[model samples]
Target: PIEDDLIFRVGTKGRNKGEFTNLQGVAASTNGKILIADSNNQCVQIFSNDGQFKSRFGIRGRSPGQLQRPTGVAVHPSGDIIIADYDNKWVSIFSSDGKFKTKIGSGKLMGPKGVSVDRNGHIIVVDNKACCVFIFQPNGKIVTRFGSRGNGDRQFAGPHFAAVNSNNEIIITDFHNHSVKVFNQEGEFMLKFGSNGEGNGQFNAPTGVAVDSNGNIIVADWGNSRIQVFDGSGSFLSYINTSADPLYGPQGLALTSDGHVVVADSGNHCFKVYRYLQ
Candidate 1:
């Protein structure tokens, strides 16, 4: 039999370095850090591959450098830390060691809830409040933005997260509409999958998403309280057996360099890691 379904889980509800409160987005850096955007704590906590707390940074404020309710966190290929501040309405960039380098999307974003870095180093921000997604260059230039309110194949209603596949296409979870939409690098809709149901291919308010090295799409089903796998073309594949330790409204999902699936278990105020073979 396989070793175990769950590899490990870190943090509890608290303001301490290793603890979390309403943890939202989880990102795995190539540097071997499990970064978590602790929303209620208003900071990002970094943990080691084995679930040890390395350090934490950020604070509450509307000014630059401060993070007021950071909901999303992403790691650039160059090692910069990107945080999506929902309350501040901006994405702040920090050096690998937590030094404030710069910020972006001040006048253009409205409640950015999730962030991701594409193959070309472009930053993707999911604006839950704005009902759209924005792509920004590392230098803070807008590459393109797409989606709007409604339930058509081209629109989004409270979209939550984005993950870039090996093809550099963006895969977003359409939260309110219960689907996942794919778009080309130039912001044009490519294809769409998912529906409102509890079945294998169906989603009940899907939230977090990540594409693996093999192009398999892993999605966190918020209402289903579990994670599901899909093929590159959005076909149903399998499910992450979290039955031993069920999730409660999971938000974000990412894969660590150690071959583990890390998720921001928001309802439980913690991060969970499952042994991911691919």
Candidate 2:
């Protein structure tokens, strides 16, 4: 059944290749490769869809190709890895093989949190301190930015992670506002959902957001310790939270090509995989 379809759980508490100290973000490549942001290890680890440790990259430094407190990660359509270096305050781009390509938002971005690549190949990054989302061209040029530090429709109170849906709209998680806000590709506020509570449609410190191939919004409700599913119209559909295998502080979320949901369970220091049932 969809409610109990946890396929597997991968990772343990360690700093080794297959292990994780504090898993922050996760992404999947089109070729069935899984990428995880091993935050405390200051690197990104690659694994097969079956959870085999293939390889790892990045080191603890301020130079290029290195990462310090990397939080969000995404794979470009062209097979590049985009990372949000939270400490370095930059969005670093690298080849699929871990070679550094270039960096953006060096002095401009304050507290870069999440990184995502849109269908148009444009990069979308969320700035926690700045309270806005910056859209960038593939060439590392800023295209546009929106949002502010407010509770208004177009404002964000502590935006964490971001994802582009199948329709190319942007979906972001507001940690302070306790809601998930949707915006058009051009950064216009489209709609929003959720409130501060433990109810079915409510959220408490929701951190991670992802849009699956079916356009369903999958959210990592952090404080509530559950994965909530919603349609594109901001309607809550179903939630995933099992008593046998409870999720604690799920922070990062990604959809695999074969309809699997990869979740970075921060409190458990592991990554869990679940089948995405429609």
Candidate 3:
């Protein structure tokens, strides 16, 4: 069973430097840095591993480095920050120190919601409006894309988020489908799990996903207002809920290098931290 392992909570409802108006995504870098996507502020905020605010970048605009309703954020092994600018219809890359690097998919992307970088340095982005996942090289060149609009095996209905596992496999959260899907690094369907329900092992409008060092799959069960943990094979192991830490509409999730779970509590307009003891 999952324990009530919450460690601490950060942020409050506001638009200040450390405060969050609409926190959407949370990602941890290998170097112990935390990046948060603040949609209402239209920027990504960086923080120390201990939850102290460090720096932030981007503003609401249509320019190359500016972000318009940024939603998802990922950190590359090389210390680059990759942001999914939703309304801007592009992905922006920035240096660890907040310098603009480059932009991808300006004229071709639609509703880019989540992003992840694989071991091979390939950039993967999920588009809720396009109903597909696009793969790009480190240089921002399009590699390939897959999926369609449906609830079928490889199809996606409101694909909301994605993460890359230790094996480089891509895990995606299908919101409208109420399930999680796995795919090979090359965009080939592998397996999927979950259904629309409130029971254990089931999901109702799942959102974010992350693969821990132990290969455990953690999902933000949005509609159920909880977090579910499953083994790599899709077998349910345990779950975290309000009983664990007053989670309200949790959306984005990420495992820290020091074995901490960081979640974006969208409904509460804050970020919650938990430590999985087991």
lDDT of every model, 2 decimals: 0.88, 0.87, 0.86
lDDT of model 2, residue 196: 86
User: Please, what are the lDDT tens digits per residue for candidate 1 over residues 28-139?
Assistant: 9988989988888888888888899888888688999998889888999888899999899999999888889999999999889889988888999999999999999978
List where candidate 2 sits over 4 angstroms from the true fold.
1-3
In candidate 2, position 122 carries an lDDT of 89
Error of 2 at 252 (Å): 0.8
* TM-score per candidate, chains pooled: 0.96, 0.96, 0.96
| Residue-by-residue lDDT tens digits, candidate 3, 156-221 | 999988988888999999999888999998899999988788887887998978998777899987
What is the lDDT for 225 in model 1?
84
Best by lDDT: 1
Pick out the ten consecutive residues of candidate 3 with the lowest summed lDDT: 239-248
